[PDB]
Structure formats: C-alpha cells, structure tokens
Write a protein that binds this ligand. Sequence first.
Ligand SMILES: O=C(O)CCC[C@@H]1c2ccccc2C[C@H]1NC(=O)c1cc2cc(F)ccc2[nH]1
Length: 578
Amino acid sequence: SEVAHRFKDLGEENFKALVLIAFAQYLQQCPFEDHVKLVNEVTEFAKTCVADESAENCDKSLHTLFGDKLCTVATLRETYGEMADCCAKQEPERNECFLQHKDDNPNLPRLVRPEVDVMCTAFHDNEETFLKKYLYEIARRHPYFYAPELLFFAKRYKAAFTECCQAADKAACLLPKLDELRDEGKASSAKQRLKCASLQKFGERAFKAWAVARLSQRFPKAEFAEVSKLVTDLTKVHTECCHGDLLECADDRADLAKYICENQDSISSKLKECCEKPLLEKSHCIAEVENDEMPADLPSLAADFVESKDVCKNYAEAKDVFLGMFLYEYARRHPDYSVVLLLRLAKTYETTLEKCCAAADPHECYAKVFDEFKPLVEEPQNLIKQNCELFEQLGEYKFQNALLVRYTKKVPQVSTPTLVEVSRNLGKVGSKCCKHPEAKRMPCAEDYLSVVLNQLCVLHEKTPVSDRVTKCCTESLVNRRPCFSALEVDETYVPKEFNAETFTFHADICTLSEKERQIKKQTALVELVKHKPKATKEQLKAVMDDFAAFVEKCCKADDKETCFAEEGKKLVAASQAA
Ligand SMILES: O=C(O)CCC[C@@H]1c2ccccc2C[C@H]1NC(=O)c1cc2cc(F)ccc2[nH]1
C-alpha cells in the first residue's frame, strides 16, 4: 500500500498539504472549496489503509487514486473542457495528459489581499482554512512549485500572522514579511521551472550534469563517488516532483537531508547549523548554503584529462563516468564559473574526444583542448561587466527599459506582457549580482539569467510566434543565453501600424502601486517599439519622459478624467511625427 506508506512517513499534516498542491497544480481553474473537499476524502481514505493495508483500493497507485478523485470535478468541460480529455484515459496516459495541460500563464486574477485587520481576523477565526488558502493560491498560479518548499514557506506564512497579529502595529510587522515571502516565493518557482524543463525537455542526463557541476561547486572536499550519490538522489527527487509524484518527492527529499546530515564529514563543513534546524527548514537551509573551502592542494586538471595516456580507453569503457569526473574535477576547482559555463566546457571536451580518438595522434590534437575553453570563459564575463557597467549608470528601472528595448527589438513577435515580465526579471540581475565582486558575479548572473530565459521559453512555447525564440529554446538548454545574446534587431519584422485604445489611459492609474504603474509605463514603451523600431535612438528614452509626466500630472490635476481623454489624445499622435 502506497497511500499508506506515504501517510506514515510524511504524517497527516504534510500529507494533507501535499495532496492540496497536487490537485491545485493539476486543476488550476478549479475553486478552493472543491479541492479541500477532495483532499479530505483522500485523507479519510489514507487513514483506512493505515488501519488496514489490505483494505479495498489501498494497493492502487497514488496517481490512480489522485486522478480518479480529481476527475470527479474535472470532466465538467463546460467549465474546463480540456481536462475532461485526461479523465478519459487510464494511467499512465492520464497523468501524462494532466502534465501536458499545466498552464504557466493561467487566466487567473491578480490576487488582492485585504487589510491587515481583516486578514488577522481570518487567521485567528480559523487558521487551518487561512493557510490552506495560501497553499491553494500559490500552487495553482505556480504548477511546478517545488512542493516540499511550498511547505517550508507555509510555515513562514503561518509564523508571520502568528507573530504580527499580536504586534502593537500589525502592519509594520506583517507587510515586510509577506512581501519577502512573495518575492522569495516567485524566485523558488522560477528556479524550479528550469529544473523541470531540464528533465522534461532535455532528459535526465542533462539534469545530472547540471547537478554534478552544481553540487560539486558546493562540496569540493567530497569524493566524486559521494557526489554521484547525492546527484542520483537529487535527480530522483526532482524527477518525482516534475512528474506530479509529490508525496514521494517530499519524502525522498527528507531522506536526502537526513543522509546529508548523517554524513557531513564526507560532504561539507558549512552544514553543522542547518542540521540542527527543524525538519522543514533543514532541507531549504542546505540548498541555500555557501560553498565549502576548496581543498588546499589539488593536482592540475590537465594531467588526468589531457597528458595521461589511454584517455580514450577510459572514455570508451565508461564515457559518462569519464565525463562526469571531468565535470566534477573542473567544477570543484571553479566556483566562479557559472554552472552553464561548466556544462559548455564539459561539452566542448566530449566533442573533441570524439574527433581525436580517431586514430592518428590524439595525444596531440587534444593537447590544445584547454586553449579551446578560453573564448567561452570570457564571452559571458564581458557581458556581465558591460551589463553591470550600464546598471549603475541607469538604476534598476531605466536598465529594464533598456533591456525591454533591446529584447523587444531582438524578438518583436513576442506577446507584450511576456516581454515586460521577462525584461524586468532580466533587469533584476543588476541589483542581485553587480553588488558582488567578480569572484561570485558570473555564476550569480549567468545562472540567474538561465532561469529568466527558460521563463521566456515556456511562456512562449504555449503560443509560439517568433522562430528565433523557438530556436534558442529548443536548440540547446546550456546555450540559450549566448543564443539570445547574439541575436540582433529583426529585419523581417513588419510593424503593426498603430492603435488609439492602447495609450489613452484611465483614472484608475492613480490608485495603483508604483510597482504596477511602472508596469503600465513599461507596456506603453513596448508597444511603441513594436510600432517603430526602424528609428529607435534616444527618442525612445525621450518619448518615455512624455508619458511619465502625463501620468503624474493628471494624477495631481484635480479633474474628472478630463486630460486623460483630451490631453491624452494630443500626445499619442505627436510622436508618430516626433
Ligand atoms: O532539492 C532541493 O533541496 C532543491 C535543490 C537544491 C540543490 C542542492 C541541494 C543540496 C546541496 C546543494 C544543492 C545545489 C542545489 N541545486 C542543484 O543542485 C541544481 C540541480 C539542477 C538541475 C538543473 F537542471 C538546473 C539547475 C539545477 N540546480
């Protein structure tokens, strides 16, 4: 019995929560009350299997049980329609079909949060429903959220209201925390979407490689064999979470933590404090810990991987173990190399070996391999330096605008809201990484960008328009960023001539946050460039100034939406000439 094993292992509290997220990530448009009804029926059921594992149904697989139960509300197409398709299939077709239809951009409201007192009224009135709501809203919006982490944040959500709803000034306590969790939440989600894309679109060999490089950069003292064991374990975990198998993911992550802490001495020295933490924190902590000291003595790379003889012999006998060793050795020495750089280097090594082992002087042709790595190292460093140069002169907001312009010219077929969300997350690199010194700049940035471009890749894949986006995304996971970097203004592109409705704003603009107000200005920008790229000097950064003033002047004009219709029409036309 599976539903039993996982109840015993996770306990009722987590068990209940994971199931909520499973259902919410599979049926996003479906309402809260329904998912809560469903989860409860499964929990009622799981307990019976704990009492008696030979009971009827207990030997069904979790998808079987979870799927049957979802479909008791999903088959109704008049509401969903397409989800009735998976419901027609048996497993494993149906679970494949549910994954197939996870919406990265679901037509869901923006979640408004009421005032602190209302909120705190809801929390003490019934904190169990309040929390269930939190899990519900995030997962349905983030169908690939790493479920074990969603539990760790729910704890932080709960603890905030617990504390802050007794503070003398509740808001000042609460709002910083909620926002930090909103922000920290978004970022986990993106990180986790790149993991699932690796696995689902490129295969586990990719995930391993990324994992091998990554884990090794953190645990350079550890033997390859050990890392391999951590990787195989990490792989299984995220493979499970990416296939919808959330109980088993959560559980396996918990075992991985337990193991990591039992064997600190074989893994790292930065762990001691994480392993004293509570169970939920214990794993998150581990994932966000600084690198261990690099072993004082290490031999040169070249010996084992160039200057040795019978390099092909090892390559032949076990290439995946030979290339993994390279990747391990190279990564543990180079914690300033982004993980994707390490993966291109590792690929450039594989391709060369294929060429050289044919026959003639190998020990010669593959001598200058390390020479072949030099350009790959600098190419991205240049861009970070350069794009950090531009950051401090422009500030975070103006820099985004520049990236918008850059990326909107780059790939102008792309949906506007996409361009904006993306360009802004791209812009966020400056603040995060430029802060640092070069030693930690490259991995910070280039990897952070990897997350943001995979973001673009998925939101695009949904409804593909530009062939250049589809190319850079499908071509090669590791090479996505150089691929976008190298693109240039699209000559093919026929502009859309104009529109009236798009630029004359309404009064509600004044009542929105600077956050959302910048977003309304940044949309405006993106449309203009769509309408007029051919010419695109400062005149872009010029006519932006023309809208921002028009926004704030009419939001302090004291007039009944007058200038928005009258003075808003004078401007929009003027730039078509100007
Ligand atoms: O399972 C988790 O706790 C989240 C993953 C966190 C991972 C962890 C865990 C312990 C020690 C170091 C580290 C590094 C940390 N991330 C990765 O290893 C990692 C794998 C991976 C695979 C991809 F296709 C793309 C990005 C990736 N990052």
